[PDB]
Each structure stands twice: as structure tokens, then as C-alpha cells.
Design a binder for this molecule. Structure first.
Ligand SMILES: O=C1NCCOCCNc2ccn3ncc(c3n2)-c2cccc1c2
Ligand code: NA
Length: 328
């Protein structure tokens, strides 16, 4: 059954952990495994204590996220529908223990410097179970990169990568992300000028602008394979649809409107909505290092505005990728 924390996180590996993110689910750390950067997502399961305002999931309830993470990871090595635009999954383990002090140390440092919305994970007993997901390290989230991007040409590339990755997953898996806020879009430097994807056997390229995009956090995601659907049922969630203060929180309501609160169904319009939300962030809440005060750059801005203006008339990421003028 479960293994101790030390089996996953030996001393050196613990000692190198930096907290990089969080959610109601728990905690995400960066560290090094075998001279290689990785991200570790740690989720308490099976206990009766409240954690970050919700009850803990059972093993069964975490399975969808495992399954989805594996399917999306495997898209990097497929042929007919291939993308690197999600994130690699290296391993999954069930560990038992109280939270390691060194993780609490890193948790504390993040709380001091960025602030946390979570409870300090220091109340878990030595019998507590967790799922520990080890992912490829994908870079730095778009929200934290909001002042660091070169130009709207970089924004273009990012939108295109996002759209293509979502299209490929629609075509292969009937996938919806369902929570693609800008904290879930990672950016990593690359010296490849072009990135490659394949959609339904047809290969294409996207100019990278020096960046490679990774879509992460499949907590709310949905997909299906051979008529078996894997999804998170939020039909009875209340709090999810009553946020405000950001367009993010309208997306949850607009998804519910689109699917009539039936979360098993496939409504790839949800991917369109998130992409609309992300385009909105690109035009409003980003500061680019080069302003668009050249004609060429000003033309890119108009195309993105045109995208913002019209994309809600498309029915899926596939529709957008294949048909929207922004990508021609
Ligand atoms: O659920 C995930 N995070 C929640 C959002 O936190 C993003 C923090 N920054 C980061 C920054 C880099 N990485 N590299 C991989 C992940 C990650 N995360 C990752 C992979 C899978 C899931 C998640 C993260
Ligand atoms: Na990736």
C-alpha cells in the first residue's frame, strides 16, 4: 500500500524543494530529481479533517486527475494527434506521514513572500495519506510573467500554442480543461524557433517567440475514451459559481450556462471561453517590454482584438485553430 514520504522525497530532494504554487487541492513544489527539475503536487486524501476549506478526496476521487494527467502527457509521443503543450507526468505515489518539516519550511517562505490562501499543512498525523504527483518542470506561470513578455507577438504565439494544444486534445480525447486561468499556463524558454504539432494526421508549426507553453492543473478537466467519461462533477458545487472581481469567475458561470450543469457531457465551447478569458488578460493586464509602436506590431494587436471580438462565435479550439483568421 502506501510508502513513507522519504521514499519519494529523500533528504536531498526535500532540501531542494521550493514551493511554487497551491490550490484548494494542496501544494506544489519545485525540486531536483536525478539532476533534473521537477514539480511535485501533493494532495491529502482519505482523512476527515477540513483542508483549505474542503473535505479531502478519497483515492477514487483523485483517479480522474491521474488518468487525465497521464493521457495529456502521452500526447507528446503520439502521431496523429501530437502535442507537447500539456505537461509530462513522471510518477504517481501514495505516501503516508505527517508533513515533512522541510516542506513546512518551504511553505512558510512562500507564505512570507507571496502570501498563501491555504492552511499551513502542519496538522496531518503520521497515518495521513497523500497522493504525490511528479511532473516535468514547465517554467513559470503566465500571471507571474505578466510584466516579463517581449511583445504582442509573444502573446500571439502563446494564444496559438494554447489553441493548438487544446485542439489536439479535443480531437484525440474530447478534452476540456475547465479551469484554464492564467496561473495554469506555464512559459519556458526554448531556442527552437518553430514548435510542431499534429492534428488529425496533419502536421503544422507555430513560431515560438522563444517560448514553449505548458497547460497544467487538470483538477476540473474532462475527457473520454471509447465512450467512458472521466470528469469532475461540480454540479452541486455552490462556491465555484459565485466568485467575482475577475472575468475568471464569470467563465465558471458561462460554462454552467453552456452545459446546463451536466458536466459529463462534452462542450468544447468551454475551451473557447477560457481562451477568450486568456486573450482578455493578454490585452488588459499584461505589460510588454516592447510596446506595439511599429506598424507590424500594431497590426498584430488589431488581429488579437479581432480575435477577442469574434472568438466566442466559434464552437471549439479545433474550430478556432482551423478557421480563425488570427492563425492564417
Ligand atoms: O496543479 C498544478 N499546479 C497548480 C497551479 O500552480 C502552478 C505553479 N507553478 C508551476 C510551475 C512549474 N510547473 N511545472 C509543472 C507544474 C508547475 N507548476 C505543474 C504540473 C501539474 C500540475 C500543476 C503544476
Ligand atoms: Na509542455
Amino acid at each position: 500500500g502506501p510508502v513513507p514520504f522519504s521514499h519519494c522525497l529523500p533528504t536531498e530532494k526535500l532540501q531542494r524543494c521550493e514551493k511554487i504554487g497551491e490550490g484548494v487541492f494542496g501544494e506544489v513544489f519545485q525540486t531536483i530529481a536525478d539532476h533534473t527539475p521537477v514539480a511535485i503536487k501533493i494532495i491529502a486524501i482519505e482523512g476527515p479533517d477540513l483542508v483549505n476549506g474542503s473535505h479531502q478526496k478519497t483515492f477514487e476521487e483523485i483517479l480522474p486527475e491521474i488518468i487525465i494527467s497521464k493521457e495529456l502527457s502521452l500526447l507528446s509521443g503520439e502521431v496523429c494527434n501530437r502535442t507537447e503543450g500539456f505537461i509530462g507526468l513522471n510518477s504517481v505515489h501514495c505516501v503516508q506521514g505527517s508533513y515533512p518539516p522541510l516542506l513546512l519550511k518551504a511553505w512558510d517562505h512562500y507564505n512570507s513572500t507571496k502570501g498563501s490562501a491555504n492552511d499551513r499543512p502542519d496538522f496531518f498525523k503520521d497515518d495521513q495519506l497523500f497522493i504525490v504527483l511528479e511532473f516535468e518542470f514547465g517554467g513559470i506561470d503566465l500571471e507571474q510573467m505578466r510584466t516579463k513578455l517581449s511583445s504582442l507577438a509573444t502573446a500571439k504565439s502563446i494564444l496559438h500554442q494554447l489553441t493548438a494544444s487544446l485542439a489536439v486534445a479535443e480531437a484525440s480525447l474530447r478534452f476540456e480543461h475547465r479551469d484554464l486561468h492564467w496561473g495554469n499556463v506555464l512559459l519556458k524558454k526554448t531556442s527552437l524557433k518553430k514548435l510542431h504539432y499534429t492534428l488529425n494526421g496533419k502536421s503544422s508549426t507555430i513560431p515560438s517567440c522563444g517560448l514553449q507553453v505548458s497547460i497544467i492543473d487538470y483538477t476540473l478537466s474532462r475527457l473520454e475514451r471509447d465512450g467512458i467519461v472521466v470528469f469532475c462533477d461540480v454540479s452541486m458545487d455552490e462556491d465555484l459559481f459565485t466568485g467575482d472581481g475577475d472575468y475568471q469567475f464569470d467563465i465558471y458561470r458561462l460554462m454552467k450556462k453552456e452545459n446546463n450543469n451536466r458536466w459529463g457531457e462534452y462542450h468544447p465551447y468551454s475551451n473557447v471561453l477560457w481562451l477568450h478569458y486568456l486573450t482578455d488578460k493578454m490585452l488588459k493586464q499584461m505589460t510588454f517590454k516592447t510596446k506595439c509602436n511599429t506598424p507590424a506590431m500594431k497590426q498584430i494587436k488589431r488581429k488579437i482584438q479581432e480575435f477577442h471580438r469574434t472568438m466566442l462565435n466559434f464552437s471549439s479550439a479545433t474550430d478556432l485553430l482551423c478557421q480563425h483568421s488570427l492563425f492564417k
